[PDB]
Amino acid sequence: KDQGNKKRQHGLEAKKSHILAARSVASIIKTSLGPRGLDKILISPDGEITITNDGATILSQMELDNEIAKLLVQLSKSQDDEIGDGTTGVVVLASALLDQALELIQKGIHPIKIANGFDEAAKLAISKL
Amino acid sequence: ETVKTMEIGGDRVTVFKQEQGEISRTSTIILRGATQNNLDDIERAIDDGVAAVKGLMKPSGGKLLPGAGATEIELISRITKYGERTPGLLQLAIKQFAVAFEVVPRTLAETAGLDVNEVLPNLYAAHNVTEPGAVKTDHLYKGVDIDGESDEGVKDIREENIYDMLATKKFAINVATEAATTVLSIDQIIMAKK
Amino acid sequence: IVVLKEGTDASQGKGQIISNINACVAVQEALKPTLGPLGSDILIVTSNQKTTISNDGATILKLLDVVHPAAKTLVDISRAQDAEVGDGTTSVTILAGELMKEAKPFLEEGISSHLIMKGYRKAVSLAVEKINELAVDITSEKSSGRELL
Amino acid sequence: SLHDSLSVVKRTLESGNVVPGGGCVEAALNIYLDNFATTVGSREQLAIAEFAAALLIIPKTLAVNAAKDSSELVAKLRSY
Amino acid sequence: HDAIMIVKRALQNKLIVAGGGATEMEVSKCLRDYSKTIAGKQQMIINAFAKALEVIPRQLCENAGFDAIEILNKLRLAHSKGEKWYGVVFETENIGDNFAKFVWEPALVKINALNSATEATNLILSVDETITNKG
Amino acid sequence: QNPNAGLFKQGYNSYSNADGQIIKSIAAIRELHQMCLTSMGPCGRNKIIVNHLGKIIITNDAATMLRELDIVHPAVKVLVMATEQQKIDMGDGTNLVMILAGELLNVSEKLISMGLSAVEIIQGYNMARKFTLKELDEMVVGEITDKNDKNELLKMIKPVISSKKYGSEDILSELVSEAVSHVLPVAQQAGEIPYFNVDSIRVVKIM
């Protein structure tokens, strides 16, 4: 159905594109991380110009069709309710795990093993802290 | 006499039926199945099945002939027999008229996955034999077998009790000739862009 | 003065079956990662703008609604697999799709599609016969309604 | 014509080691390698399985030029 | 509660087969052994049907991280020799008995899927032409 | 630079006998002829035709497929109307009429290559038809007694239900023969008034 204007990537070009798509979106708020981070000029669809360094405000105003970047928006909704300070830090940290995952995919590591590898590594980091 | 509600296929439906008194001329066939597309062809198969019952009336509804490729091959030997019997230029069209009946057994072999080089010479030797006598005997019933199992070659169609009704076969020949007569009679047409 | 197909030609013959095989592989390769409890999930973005993520292959195929007839047949058996049973919705399409892949080289060698269908029908009758033998249901085996469970 | 017929038998009897032809060697090695492929494994079972099935192309090609069905002969050849 | 939920689904369906590739590998092996009397064109068709049954355990090991190349060659040798109850362990990769670990699957899932997959296969293989009207 | 000649009427798509029009009319029917060649018979195959209402329908019978297909060739409509003669006046032969009429045009090409006029080709089939129709009366071996018994109906109904959904002919025969025997009234020694009706049997289906 609707073969035209329809894109599909499975097992070949998807693993490489999902990492680069989230890397370009996360690279926007990397310079805004921290109190010394740099502001941005945001324009609402109604024409109002606002300036803030908060990652939540910047990500919430984003309306995008990128399927991987929507996962960053779905988590940001739960970040403000649970904590609210995990907006910019987690997205950069989550993208850091994706960049290291892409290096393991090129080495032949199974993606679920990478998922279970970060889960077991996160449990060890909690016991050390 | 009886109006009830019964469960057909998992759903409650109200059944309207009878037993003996108040004789009704209408009957209903209830079907069940998981596949929706298969039930569509079964209802159409019943419609074609009950329509053949209408052909059982006075105009020669009881007469039968062996089908599944049995009659089509035997008619070829009879048509070629009349080709040499009828002098004149008609010998070219009469011989080609019998060859046109070779497509029926061929398609039955192609749709069955059978080799075209196998069934055709087997049906020829089965329907053409030399009998030590005036009356031709033994098997005139050899058709195109469904195969997919068993052993070899062809066999009498009477074993499976399958035959073609004369009212269907005789009427189909008249329609097939008149349909080809119209096309062969038209040497020119005039159409427009649609 | 009425055009049903609007003048759209379509190929016919044994080459059309191969085109239907590639349609079954495209549906299979999408459902290959979704097989199993640890299997991958498919992200589908509908034209309605609602984006959903589901592991169950039924809902995945219900949102796509492929118009292709050979691919829709795999969707129809998937909805009945989730309804009458509820388990094996993804595996029934992969098994049917992979069975289409094994019949692809048979058409290239000249084997008719009829004997291919009858060849698998005889194998299923022998396969189901072995399933009943491999199945374990015990009464007189010195088990009970409890000790077995 | 006799000297040409003698050379066929003489050259055949000249070699004291002969094997049955006409597809006997290709079909026999196919059965032996199927049972041997499981006895080794180690990612080499798929290569042996394809190497055994690749020996049936010679009798299958001969059936094409013989007008006989290759699917009937080769399949029954393996089973006998 | 974990023990009740296991015996609950096992009581609903009294027809149970051993899962974990055990039953799937036996059906593929028997159809190859029965094919000797099926010899002829029907032999090579069923031999590929038994090979088509190998995709179910394949994707299960590929999606779980296991290597489908080694596990399918080791399962076939362990299943064909000795006991037929040897499956594939879903936790730690190794050959083992799922009937001993009491990991089971109902047969009505496999029986209804095998009949539906074959029925849908015969419908597609029988279509030589497809005409789609617009409207 | 290149002028135009040969069409004196109006702008259209014109076909003449000098271009082999009799071959083009057969080749146009041959496109839909191969579809019916794989239809008739118990080993026949089914074709998919998407309806204009957005519904996929698959069936073996050609008389139903010819109605759903859009045919712009009027030469094919001659066989389509001839197929309606098999569906309406009779209950069988819809798949057979397309194979016979399509082959009569194929064997006629050999007579056209020899230069034989179409009239002698038609006259040849007309004389050969009377030879075949005369033999069809002698091709009959047995005759149904029209006893209308349940066991007697299973003999006529079984081959009619066949060539569709093969393998179910034994189960479907008991369902049809039981419904037909109920519609057929009980009478004897009267052959003047017809009895059975097609619309008297309504088939239902539930998933």
UniProtKB/Swiss-Prot annotation, chain A:
<comment type="subunit">
    <text>Heterooligomeric complex of about 850 to 900 kDa that forms two stacked rings, 12 to 16 nm in diameter.</text>
</comment>
<comment type="function">
    <text>Molecular chaperone; assists the folding of proteins upon ATP hydrolysis. Known to play a role, in vitro, in the folding of actin and tubulin. In yeast may play a role in mitotic spindle formation.</text>
</comment>
<comment type="similarity">
    <text>Belongs to the TCP-1 chaperonin family.</text>
</comment>
<protein>
    <recommendedName>
        <fullName>T-complex protein 1 subunit epsilon</fullName>
    </recommendedName>
</protein>
Swiss-Prot record, chain C:
<protein>
    <recommendedName>
        <fullName>T-complex protein 1 subunit eta</fullName>
    </recommendedName>
</protein>
<comment type="subunit">
    <text>Heterooligomeric complex of about 850 to 900 kDa that forms two stacked rings, 12 to 16 nm in diameter.</text>
</comment>
<comment type="function">
    <text>Molecular chaperone; assists the folding of proteins upon ATP hydrolysis. Known to play a role, in vitro, in the folding of actin and tubulin. In yeast may play a role in mitotic spindle formation.</text>
</comment>
<comment type="similarity">
    <text>Belongs to the TCP-1 chaperonin family.</text>
</comment>
Swiss-Prot record, chain D:
<comment type="function">
    <text>Molecular chaperone; assists the folding of proteins upon ATP hydrolysis. Known to play a role, in vitro, in the folding of actin and tubulin. In yeast may play a role in mitotic spindle formation.</text>
</comment>
<comment type="similarity">
    <text>Belongs to the TCP-1 chaperonin family.</text>
</comment>
<protein>
    <recommendedName>
        <fullName>T-complex protein 1 subunit alpha</fullName>
    </recommendedName>
</protein>
<comment type="subunit">
    <text>Heterooligomeric complex of about 850 to 900 kDa that forms two stacked rings, 12 to 16 nm in diameter.</text>
</comment>
UniProtKB/Swiss-Prot annotation, chain F:
<comment type="function">
    <text>Molecular chaperone; assists the folding of proteins upon ATP hydrolysis. Known to play a role, in vitro, in the folding of actin and tubulin. In yeast may play a role in mitotic spindle formation.</text>
</comment>
<feature type="cross-link" description="Glycyl lysine isopeptide (Lys-Gly) (interchain with G-Cter in ubiquitin)">
    <location>
        <position position="9"/>
    </location>
</feature>
<comment type="subunit">
    <text>Heterooligomeric complex of about 850 to 900 kDa that forms two stacked rings, 12 to 16 nm in diameter.</text>
</comment>
<protein>
    <recommendedName>
        <fullName>T-complex protein 1 subunit theta</fullName>
    </recommendedName>
</protein>
<comment type="similarity">
    <text>Belongs to the TCP-1 chaperonin family.</text>
</comment>
